[PDB]
A = this chain, B = another copy of it.
Amino acid sequence: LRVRRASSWELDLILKEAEKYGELLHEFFCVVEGKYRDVYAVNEEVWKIIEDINMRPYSLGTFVGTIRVDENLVEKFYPNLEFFSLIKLEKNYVILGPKASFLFTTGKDAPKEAVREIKWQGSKRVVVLNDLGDIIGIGLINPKSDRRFIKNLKD
């Protein structure tokens, strides 16, 4: 592993992803060149340090996902759920009732009737909130389906 600050390109990929949902509140990222490019949210100090000193991933901050080239030969940032804690959430989310929220955390899809609020602006992937506004996972909207309207991806 080489560990470095994120490239301008990589930041844009990370930003593109965050901006599907809202405002990216966190500025500083490092990349761990492994098999794939792992993205860490780092504090400003670590971001500064990493210029002069290689640091191991366990000293960096928070792993928030990976950059890979997808099927279409398009580089994408693939966030983990932790990445979403960096976002002031504004859109492409659904709020589920408490029962459905709970079930969602067990890997269950959510039915449409369980959706209390949806603010959807296009994204396939939506942030799934429980009824307390907390992120419980990421879901795949299934615009046509009812029982499985929000397909469980991550929880």
CB within 8 Å of B: which residues of A? 25-26, 34, 38, 43-46, 49, 53, 55-59, 63, 85-86, 88, 98-99, 101-103, 105-106, 108, 131-134
Q: Which residues of B contact A86 (CB under 8 A)?
A: 132
- Smallest CB separation, A115 vs chain B (Å): 16
| Cα–Cα distance between A33 and B91 once the two chains are bound (Å) | 34
Which 8 residue pairs spanning A and B have beta carbons closest together? A58-B102, A63-B106, A45-B59, A58-B99, A25-B132, A45-B56, A46-B59, A43-B58
Let me know if B85 and A134 touch, CB within 8 A. yes
- Smallest CB separation, A146 vs chain B (Å): 16
Q: List 28 A-B contacts (CB under 8 A).
A: A25-B131, A25-B132, A25-B133, A34-B108, A38-B106, A43-B98, A43-B99, A44-B98, A45-B55, A45-B56, A45-B58, A45-B59, A49-B49, A49-B53, A49-B55, A53-B53, A56-B99, A56-B102, A57-B99, A57-B103, A58-B98, A58-B99, A58-B101, A58-B103, A63-B105, A63-B106, A85-B132, A85-B134
